[PDB]
C-alpha cells in the first residue's frame, strides 16, 4: 500500500548554456564562475596553445568545459517495508454450482 | 617585473548557515538542496534512528 521513493535515475538529458574556458600554457589552470553550481557538469582537459591562439609560450595548456544539466523522464525507484502489504487469497470449494 | 598569479590557498576559514539532514533507516540516503553549490562543504555519515 505505502511505498517510499528511494531514487531517481535520469534516462534522457539535454544540455544548455555550454560555457568553456582555457587558461594559458602552464600558468593557470582554468576556472569558470558557473562551475560553482553542481547542476553544471564540468571537466578539465589539456589541449594546446600558441600565438596562433594568441597567448604565448607555446605549450599544452589546460581547458575546462561546462554544461547545464536538464532531465527528461526518469526511473522512479521505490521501496516497501514488510508491512503495508496485503495478500488476497480466494479460497473456493468444490461440489457443484455450475457457471 | 611581471608575475602571473597561480594559486590561492585559504589559511583561515569560517562557517555559516550550517544545514543538516537525515532521511530514515535504510530507505533513503539524505539529500539537501544547498548541496547544489560547491561553495558549501558537505559530508555523508551514518548515525542511528
Amino acid at each position, epitope marked *: *500500500k*505505502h511505498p517510499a521513493t528511494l531514487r531517481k535515475y535520469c534516462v534522457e538529458a539535454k544540455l544548455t548554456n555550454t560555457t568553456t574556458a582555457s587558461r594559458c600554457p602552464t600558468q593557470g589552470e582554468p576556472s569558470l564562475n558557473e562551475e560553482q553550481d553542481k547542476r553544471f557538469v564540468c571537466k578539465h582537459s589539456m589541449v594546446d596553445r600558441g600565438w596562433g591562439n594568441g597567448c604565448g609560450l607555446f605549450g599544452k595548456g589546460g581547458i575546462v568545459t561546462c554544461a547545464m544539466f536538464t532531465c527528461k523522464k526518469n526511473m522512479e525507484g521505490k521501496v516497501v517495508q514488510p508491512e503495508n502489504l496485503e495478500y488476497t487469497i480466494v479460497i473456493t470449494p468444490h461440489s457443484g454450482e455450475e457457471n | 617585473k611581471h608575475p602571473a598569479t597561480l594559486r590561492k590557498y585559504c589559511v583561515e576559514a569560517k562557517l555559516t548557515n550550517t*544545514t*543538516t*539532514a*537525515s*532521511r530514515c533507516p535504510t530507505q533513503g540516503e*539524505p539529500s539537501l*538542496n544547498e548541496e547544489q553549490d560547491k561553495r558549501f562543504v558537505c559530508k555523508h555519515s551514518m548515525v542511528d*534512528r
Partner: antibody, heavy 132, light 107 residues
Framework: EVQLVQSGPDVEKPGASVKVSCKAS????????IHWVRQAPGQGLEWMGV????????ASAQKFQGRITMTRDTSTSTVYMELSSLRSDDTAVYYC?????????????????????????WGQGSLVTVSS | DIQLTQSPSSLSASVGDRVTFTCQAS??????LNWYQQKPGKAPKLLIY???NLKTGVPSRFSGSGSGTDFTFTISSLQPEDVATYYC?????????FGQGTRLQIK
C-alpha cells in the same frame, strides 16, 4: 502568544522571483516544522511545500518542481520562501504554519498526525500578484 | 495524488439547523483527516483533527466521524458566525491534497 507573522503583500513581474517571510513567536522555534500553502482566489487551498527549522531540510510538491526554495534564520526564528519563475497563475494568497515535529527532520505522517494544515498558529497572509 | 472529493459544493440553511458534509478518498486514509473553516478574506481556524477530535477553544457544536474513506462532518446547531468555506483534508502519503471546499449561506 502562539503566533506567526507574515510579510506584506507584494506585486512582481512575470518571470521574476518573490520572497515571503514567516516570523515566529511564542514557543521554541525548533519544536515544529513550517509548511507553505497557497490559495488562488478562484480556487481552494493547495500545498506548496515543507521546511524544517531544526537543521533545514526541505521538500515540495510535484507542481512546484524546481521553482521553489526554502531557507530560514534560526536567530530571528524566521522562514523564507522564494518562488522562482513567476507567471500569472502564481497570483495567490500564501500561508505558513506549524507541524508537530518528528524531532529530527521533515515529512512524517506516521506520528499520529501533523495536527493542522494550516489554521491554528498560522499568521495573517501574504498576497502575491504577478503582473506587468 | 489521493483524489479527495468534498460534497456538496455549497449549501444554504437556517440558523439552528444540523448540517453534514461528506468527504470521500480514493485511498485508505484511515484516520488522517482534518476539517477547517475559512472566513472569506480572513484568518481561518481549525475545527477537527484526526476526523473525530475537537480542538480546545472550539465550541461543542462541531463533530466529525468516519473511518474508511467516507467521512462526515456535522454542525449540530448552525449559528450566524459560522458562515465560512469548509475544507476537508487528507494527511496520508504526502502529495498533500485538500478538498475542494464547501460554502455556506445563511437563510
Amino acid at each position: 502568544e502562539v503566533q506567526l507573522v507574515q510579510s506584506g503583500p507584494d506585486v512582481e513581474k512575470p518571470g521574476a522571483s518573490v520572497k515571503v517571510s514567516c516570523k515566529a513567536s511564542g514557543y521554541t522555534f525548533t519544536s515544529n516544522y513550517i509548511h507553505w500553502v497557497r490559495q488562488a482566489p478562484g480556487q481552494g487551498l493547495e500545498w506548496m511545500g515543507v521546511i524544517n527549522p531544526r537543521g533545514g531540510s526541505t521538500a515540495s510538491a510535484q507542481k512546484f518542481q524546481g521553482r521553489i526554495t526554502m531557507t530560514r534564520d534560526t536567530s530571528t526564528s524566521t522562514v523564507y520562501m522564494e518562488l522562482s519563475s513567476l507567471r500569472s497563475d502564481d497570483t495567490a494568497v500564501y500561508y505558513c504554519a506549524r507541524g508537530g515535529r518528528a524531532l529530527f527532520y521533515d515529512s512524517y505522517t506516521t506520528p499520529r498526525d501533523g495536527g493542522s494544515w494550516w489554521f491554528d498558529p498560522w499568521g495573517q497572509g501574504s498576497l502575491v500578484t504577478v503582473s506587468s | 495524488d489521493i483524489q479527495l472529493t468534498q460534497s456538496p459544493s455549497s449549501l444554504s440553511a437556517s440558523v439552528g439547523d444540523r448540517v453534514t458534509f461528506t468527504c470521500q478518498a480514493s485511498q485508505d486514509i484511515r484516520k488522517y483527516l482534518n476539517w477547517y473553516q475559512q472566513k472569506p478574506g480572513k484568518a481561518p481556524k481549525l475545527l477537527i483533527y484526526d476526523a473525530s477530535n475537537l480542538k480546545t477553544g472550539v465550541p461543542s457544536r462541531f463533530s466529525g466521524s468516519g473511518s474508511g474513506t467516507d467521512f462526515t462532518f456535522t454542525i449540530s446547531s448552525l449559528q450566524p458566525e459560522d458562515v465560512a468555506t469548509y475544507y476537508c483534508q487528507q494527511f496520508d502519503d504526502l502529495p498533500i491534497t485538500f478538498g475542494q471546499g464547501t460554502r455556506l449561506q445563511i437563510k
